[PDB]
Design an enzyme around this catalytic site. Structure first.
Site, PDB file in Angstrom:
ATOM      1  N   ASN A 121       0.835  -1.194   0.000  1.00 25.80           N
ATOM      2  CA  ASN A 121       0.000   0.000   0.000  1.00 25.80           C
ATOM      3  C   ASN A 121       0.875   1.253   0.000  1.00 25.80           C
ATOM      4  OD1 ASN A 121      -1.869   2.064   0.370  1.00 25.80           O
ATOM      5  ND2 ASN A 121      -2.745   1.227   2.261  1.00 25.80           N
ATOM      6  N   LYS A 128       3.155   0.918   3.244  1.00 24.78           N
ATOM      7  CA  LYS A 128       2.778  -0.110   4.215  1.00 24.78           C
ATOM      8  C   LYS A 128       2.725  -1.463   3.522  1.00 24.78           C
ATOM      9  CE  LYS A 128      -0.105   3.148   6.856  1.00 24.78           C
ATOM     10  NZ  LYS A 128      -1.448   3.434   7.441  1.00 24.78           N
ATOM     11  N   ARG A 155      -2.776  -2.370  -3.449  1.00 26.75           N
ATOM     12  CA  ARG A 155      -3.903  -1.518  -3.113  1.00 26.75           C
ATOM     13  C   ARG A 155      -3.907  -0.303  -4.042  1.00 26.75           C
ATOM     14  NH1 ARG A 155      -7.305   0.680   2.002  1.00 26.75           N
ATOM     15  NH2 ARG A 155      -6.561   2.852   2.020  1.00 26.75           N
ATOM     16  N   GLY A 166     -10.099   7.776   8.518  1.00 31.44           N
ATOM     17  CA  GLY A 166     -11.181   8.268   7.684  1.00 31.44           C
ATOM     18  C   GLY A 166     -12.346   7.325   7.891  1.00 31.44           C
ATOM     19  N   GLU A 197      -8.303  -5.615   5.415  1.00 34.40           N
ATOM     20  CA  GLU A 197      -8.076  -5.167   4.043  1.00 34.40           C
ATOM     21  C   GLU A 197      -7.031  -6.039   3.349  1.00 34.40           C
ATOM     22  OE1 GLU A 197      -7.535  -0.704   4.761  1.00 34.40           O
ATOM     23  OE2 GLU A 197      -9.323  -0.631   3.497  1.00 34.40           O
TER      24      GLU A 197
END
Ligand SMILES: Nc1nc2c(ncn2[C@@H]2O[C@H](COP(=O)(O)O)[C@@H](O)[C@H]2O)c(=O)[nH]1
Ligand SMILES: Nc1nc2c(ncn2[C@@H]2O[C@H](COP(=O)(O)O)[C@@H](O)[C@H]2O)c(=O)[nH]1
Lengths: 394, 394
Positions: free
Chosen positions: A8, A15, A83, A204, A378
């Site tokens: 990611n 990450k 991602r 978020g 995820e």
């Protein structure tokens, strides 16, 4: 014993995780934080903080790759998942990365300049370092392309949609996807005859209505700035007020874009923290502005949850996930307190328990609707997609 | 046989009415349309289109006043009510107009430059022409000051609220007020133990949650631009998208303020009309863009209705009002179709009937919640307030 590498590439970080194919368990995790800066460090498990000074997206991945061969893992990297932030209208599912994919990702990148262009730099670097390894692109927006126009269109002139591509896309798709899949098992439901509301709450935040399997409404808009009030993000805001503020403080659209995205939200009201653990304590210590910041937070989540329910033919469950949703006892109950109109009764003994109890029902018998908490993964979902796409013959 | 004069000084018009104290019935109505322009006309009942060329707010009222003495009504004008657009945080109820009131109205006028400053010109002119006549100021925002901070605050920095006065105010307060009062009678409810949702739908549109008598949530924000998608108004819109559009078309904040307020909404999507009677026909004639404009309209009303219900402890009724709400058979049913999650069943024979049937239940027995239509009377409510304030000794 094959593994899957998950990448990611955020704005200022990379990450990564390593998962086993057999078990879907994490065998290594890390982060290359503070990218492009004068001093850039890599940190696996939080044990080695290896510095790399002025290093970019490719040089970091090379360093990470060494730290896999150093641990004899290179020869087992069967698949690599990426991602991707913004897939636009061109990606409805997960795909095997090819030239056509990179090309199509380049096309939709206008919609998210910051995130997307970093993801491409993460793909290109992985393309380089791993040749024979099949790669997969997983989109944070794809789960949402099942939305009807009446639900994704804005009240603006048509030109903007057809020509310029202005429309709601919604985010946290992989989280909303995974959580809902799990929710069918835990709640003993039928995917083809189900109605869920999924509240992803953390850094978020967004809500998502999942009707008979598919996404039919989500709170975040074209950007990740619509819907719930978040940590640093304002959430829903009167445009007539933003244009008014522009006339008062003389600030520009770019100025306000920063205030709304980085200075607003939980931080904005409290003038204290963009983090709950602190604000939850501040309240108990008698701080009012923090108490309001949370009451306001709670309120806007209940408004959207109940509002999103209107996209379902029947309500079966409500699911909490993300840093805040999984871990926060108070906000969970405060949000149910607010949604008594739907006949929700919460089992406080069940709600008391921490995140170690994982997937768990938190509502009682009298309650019209079942409440539950399901820890998002995820990474696991990215892996599963790739493991499935591993059987494909290109 | 005393009467009450009602005045509404819009941006480009003066709408007036004359009501009997005994009956609250309209004995005269009119409009001074196209104000400040090269040619300005006055039209009572739509029978005399008396021109006044270049005439202002005071000169029009003088012309109207003559047309009352011409009909021997001057000597019966017991009270004069003034519709005020924006009362800010300073006005919670209706008041008798005094110097202090004019002064306080001047103070809050910053919040609505167009409307408020015209209302003051309407007060001043009436102050002039009628001396001994007691006057009353009625606020379109006052009904909403019963809102909690968690419900009126925006996700922006605190400074803006405390210093600059940025917060949700909500509009159509008099309509939402009147309609709800009537709704208690028609539905045989207890004001102190009630939960209503009121959908004012017309030119501009808003929803309002009325819990135990008071307003606890409303869709319109600081300006009348938030909430539902309206005729020319966009409704809720992603600020990240507006800032993005600014970067694309190079348009300014003032440019977009116009697009959002005047070029968007029903008109914006359809590229046809800002009026339902046309768009409702266009659909049936096979126009898709108009069909979407209405499906999108319907959808955003259901999202907010269901969302606003979360501010109630229990849902008892849903009320339609305004030009669209009272008169439109289709949109009413489409909005219920969408809110099946709340267990709404609509009686189509009852929904068939036109506005001549006035106040009417439109839901069936199986329905968890009672649906109803109640024709708003902004004028009657203004009168009642003044008639009450007539007994006051200043
Ligand atoms: N109340 C509470 N909040 C937590 C805990 N751990 C993380 N959070 C919240 O979750 C947020 C991080 O979300 P994430 O990035 O994991 O989705 C932070 O803002 C933080 O306040 C916890 O143990 N308790
Ligand atoms: N379907 C329908 N809509 C109407 C009728 N009369 C007025 N309207 C709608 O009501 C709106 C005017 O709202 P008002 O200013 O009265 O609150 C117009 O946009 C118009 O489309 C009618 O008889 N049928």
């Amino acid at each position: 014993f094959p593994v899957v590498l998950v990448i990611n590439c955020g704005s200022s970080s990379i990450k990564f995780s390593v998962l086993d194919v057999a078990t879907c368990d994490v065998l290594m995790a890390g982060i290359a934080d503070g990218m492009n800066t004068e001093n850039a460090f890599l940190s696996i498990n939080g044990d080695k903080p290896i510095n790399l000074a002025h290093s970019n997206y490719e040089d970091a991945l090379k360093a990470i790759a060494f730290e896999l061969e150093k641990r004899d893992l290179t020869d087992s990297v069967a698949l690599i998942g990426h991602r991707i932030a913004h897939g636009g209208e061109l990606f409805t599912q997960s795909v095997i990365i090819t030239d056509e994919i990179i090309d199509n990702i380049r096309r939709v990148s206008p919609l998210a300049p910051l995130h997307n262009y970093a993801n491409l730099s993460g793909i290109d670097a992985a393309r380089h370092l791993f040749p024979a390894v099949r790669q997969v692109a997983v989109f944070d927006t794809s789960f949402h392309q099942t939305l009807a126009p009446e639900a994704y269109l804005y009240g603006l002139p048509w030109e903007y949609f057809s020509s310029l591509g202005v429309r709601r896309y919604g985010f946290h798709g992989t989280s909303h996807r995974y959580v809902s899949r799990r929710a069918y098992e835990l709640l003993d439901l039928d995917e083809k005859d189900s109605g869920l509301i999924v509240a992803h709450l953390g850094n978020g935040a967004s809500i998502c209505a999942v009707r008979n399997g598919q996404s039919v409404d989500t709170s975040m808009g074209m950007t990740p700035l619509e819907g719930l009030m978040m940590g640093t993000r304002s959430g829903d805001v009167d445009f007539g007020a933003m244009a008014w503020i522009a006339k008062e403080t003389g600030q520009t659209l770019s100025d306000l874009e920063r205030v709304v995205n980085k200075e607003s939200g939980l931080l904005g009201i409290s003038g204290l923290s963009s983090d709950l653990r602190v604000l939850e304590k501040a309240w108990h210590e008698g701080h009012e502005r923090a108490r309001l910041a949370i009451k306001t937070f709670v309120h806007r989540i209940a408004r959207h949850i109940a509002g999103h329910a209107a996209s379902l033919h029947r309500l079966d469950g409500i699911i909490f996930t993300g840093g805040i949703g999984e871990n926060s006892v108070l906000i969970r109950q405060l949000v149910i307190e607010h949604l008594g109109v739907l006949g929700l009764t919460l089992d406080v003994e069940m709600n008391k328990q921490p995140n170690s109890h994982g997937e768990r029902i938190i509502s009682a018998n009298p309650s019209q609707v079942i409440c539950a908490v399901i820890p998002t993964n995820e990474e696991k979902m990215i892996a599963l997609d790739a493991i499935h796409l591993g059987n494909v013959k290109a």
